[PDB]
Amino acid sequence: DASKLSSDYSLPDLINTRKVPNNWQTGEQASLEEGRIVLTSNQNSKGSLWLKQGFDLKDSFTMEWTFRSVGYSGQTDGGISFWFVQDSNIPRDKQLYNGPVNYDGLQLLVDNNGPLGPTLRGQLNDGQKPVDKTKIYDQSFASCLMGYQDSSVPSTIRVTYDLEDDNLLKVQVDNKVCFQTRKVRFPSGSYRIGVTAQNGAVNNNAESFEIFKMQFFNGVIEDSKLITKYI
């Protein structure tokens, strides 16, 4: 697995790091603080963290994001979104959790404003139309229940896309399967990888979403014009 780790698309541990790693960039109110990038803080905050360069999808990959939420417990309109989307530059649109409403690819949404409570949901789009935000919870292609708030220990989301297992897309939270599917077909192309968050305005909350680490691997780890399709 070391041999497969990609330094170009990973975010190293941020302890004693005095600047954002140069292959990434923050946006909006996101900032580097000691040991973590803080996406949101204080009220009605938004932040983004994206890789500067696209990823050429030609083979299986794994991506592991380590994050946490601190500072608020309760239902809100906030959320954190992890993206894997086909685009030539960082996505321009910021309407959907401070990320693109018109994406072509995958949105993984962690939030608690839907009827099921705190969830990790998979959303898909193919760039032809913006998604209808009013239908997001009814349109998830897959989901699991996932407690994330007010939680000191960070969580790790592992996303694997395994072409050698008939295009298995598998999403794990701390190594437990959240969902998996073979229905999602990402075309070869250049993809943008990043995370965006907002805490919203509900109850003037100051929920703070934090990113600690992200590891990107070429291949599948120990789990041995074209647009996204859902078959």
Beta bridge partners of 51: 24
Distances (CA, A) of 94 to 47, 65, 118, 138, 196: 10, 21, 23, 21, 9
CB atoms within 10 A of CB 209: 29
Q: E strands within 163-198?
A: 168-173, 176-181, 184-185, 189-198
Method by which the model was determined: X-ray
Measured over the CA atoms of residue 86, residue 87, residue 89 and residue 90, the dihedral's sign is: negative
What is the CATH topology of the domain spanning 1-231? Jelly Rolls (2.60.120)
Who's near 205: CB < 8 A, 6+ residues apart?
Answer: 43, 72, 74, 76, 78, 199
169 DSSP 8-state letter: E
Angle at CA of residue 123, ends 122 and 129, nearest 5°: 170
Q: Measured between alpha carbons, how far is 196 from 47 in angstroms, rounded to an integer?
A: 6
Give the helix, strand, coil percentages of the chain, each rounded to 5. Answer: 5, 45, 45
CB atoms within 10 A of CB 45: 23
Q: Measured between alpha carbons, how far is 32 from 19 in angstroms, rounded to an integer?
A: 7
Q: Measured between alpha carbons, how far is 66 from 211 in angstroms, rounded to an integer?
A: 6
Closest CA to 12 of 4, 1, 24: 24
Residue located via tokens 């969902």: 179
Distances (CA, A) of 226 to 92, 107, 169, 197: 20, 18, 19, 28
Token code pair at residue 163: 């072409």
Do residues 169 and 158 lie in contact, with contact meaning Cβ atoms separated by under 8 Å? no
Is residue 116 helix, strand or coil? coil
Indicate the length of the chain as a whole number: 231
Closest CA to 77 of 48, 108, 40, 114: 114
Q: Measured between alpha carbons, how far is 175 from 15 in angstroms, rounded to an integer?
A: 24
Token code pair at residue 181: 């599917």
Domains in the chain: boundaries: 1-231
